[PDB]
Amino acid sequence: GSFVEMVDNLRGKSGQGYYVEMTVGSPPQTLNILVDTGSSNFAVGAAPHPFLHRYYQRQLSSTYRDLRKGVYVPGKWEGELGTDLVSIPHGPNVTVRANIAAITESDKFFINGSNWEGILGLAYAEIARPDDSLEPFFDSLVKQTHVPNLFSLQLCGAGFPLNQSEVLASVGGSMIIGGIDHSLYTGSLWYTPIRREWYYEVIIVRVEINGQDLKMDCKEYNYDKSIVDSGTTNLRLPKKVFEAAVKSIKAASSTEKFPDGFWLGEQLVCWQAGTTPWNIFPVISLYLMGEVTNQSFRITILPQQYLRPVEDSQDDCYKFAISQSSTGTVMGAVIMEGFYVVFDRARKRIGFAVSACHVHDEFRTAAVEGPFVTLDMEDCGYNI
Numbered sequence: 001g002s003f004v005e006m007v008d009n010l011r012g013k014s015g016q017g018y019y020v021e022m023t024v025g026s027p028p029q030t031l032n033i034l035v036d037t038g039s040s041n042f043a044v045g046a047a048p049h050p051f052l053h054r055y056y057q058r059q060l061s062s063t064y065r066d067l068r069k070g071v072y073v074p075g076k077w078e079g080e081l082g083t084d085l086v087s088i089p090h091g092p093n094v095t096v097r098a099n100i101a102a103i104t105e106s107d108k109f110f111i112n113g114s115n116w117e118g119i120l121g122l123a124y125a126e127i128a129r130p131d132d133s134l135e136p137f138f139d140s141l142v143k144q145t146h147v148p149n150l151f152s153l154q155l156c157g158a159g160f161p162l163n164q165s166e167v168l169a170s171v172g173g174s175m176i177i178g179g180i181d182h183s184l185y186t187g188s189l190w191y192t193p194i195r196r197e198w199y200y201e202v203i204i205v206r207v208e209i210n211g212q213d214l215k216m217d218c219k220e221y222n223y224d225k226s227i228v229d230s231g232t233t234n235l236r237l238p239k240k241v242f243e244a245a246v247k248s249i250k251a252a253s254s255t256e257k258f259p260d261g262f263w264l265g266e267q268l269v270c271w272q273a274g275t276t277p278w279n280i281f282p283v284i285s286l287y288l289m290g291e292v293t294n295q296s297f298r299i300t301i302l303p304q305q306y307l308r309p310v311e312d313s314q315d316d317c318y319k320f321a322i323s324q325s326s327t328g329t330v331m332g333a334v335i336m337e338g339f340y341v342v343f344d345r346a347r348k349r350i351g352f353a354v355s356a357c358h359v360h361d362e363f364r365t366a367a368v369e370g371p372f373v374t375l376d377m378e379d380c381g382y383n384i
């Protein structure tokens, strides 16, 4: 329905991630926490670090409980396991006793200027560290309260660079805990099954670039998995898929030549203020397995999603936010910024709808459309 207390509770951007305010301990200690559907631990800075202006002080919490167990995660971090009372101020009006990994040592984990001091891993126990016995936050929340087993994310890319002050004052999106807010999307929600409960794994059955079929065996698109990950910036594709997609994107945009560094996601490209030639770049459609047998639907993104705005001048500059992976497809903030994404854990499915905050132009919009008749979709899934 309508969850006004949780609408607009995120801040951040695709490159540095999107975070929500949380409190830990008694009296409550406020921290900014990255929303991560790609991991399953709740881990917070718990010791001074040059890039942290605050951290969890266990000695100041009367409700802190020491689990007397370490956790080593190779970026990399090490911590100490414990439990405490946790709340989300712009969230459900509940307080949960949850596991917390108190980060004592780290390497390239905390980013200078991100404004977040910890991570909220929202995926399943299978990938929790040190093992699946460490109950993830969302599992605790559902078990201890009447909050429905579902959350939804609207990640909002600004479409232009935000400076330090603007990124702190800007609304970066919404995390709706326990429901679906109809103001965050347009049109219909289309659902794809969660293939397996570890990462939020899905199956891609067809890929198009400006309506042209990439025409690869669909198992290639999910080699070795395809996941939805708010913690990843880019749309990441398996090596062979990335090579075929970049060749097609280059061919579609061939009226302008870009250096190799641009296509590698390393180098920015700039245009005179307001002259970005969006129309030369193609739309990209990913077809996902539907809930009905032999049915699929598609999600279509624009270059306003896969060209990430970066500051250089008064030029409008971007980095190509599609990159290669050796660990399967990752539908990162590139994809998620185009859509309102419903993580329906209760019904083992992920919903997509056009986001009310996606960046577009007067000629094209992102889309979620269906149904399409698609055969042997189970063959698109990779095994071993």
Ligand SMILES: COc1nc(N2C[C@H]3C(=O)N(C)C(=N)N[C@@]3(c3ccc(C#N)s3)C2)nc(C)c1F
Pocket: 015, 016, 017, 034, 036, 037, 038, 039, 040, 041, 042, 043, 073, 075, 109, 119, 120, 121, 127, 128, 129, 229, 230, 231, 232
């Ligand atoms: C919170 O505890 C854990 N965190 C992570 N990750 C892996 C990273 C990563 O490479 N990606 C892609 C991701 N989705 N999440 C991590 C991030 C680190 C900085 C981000 C930003 N910005 S996101 C955090 N993995 C495990 C196994 C954990 F136990």
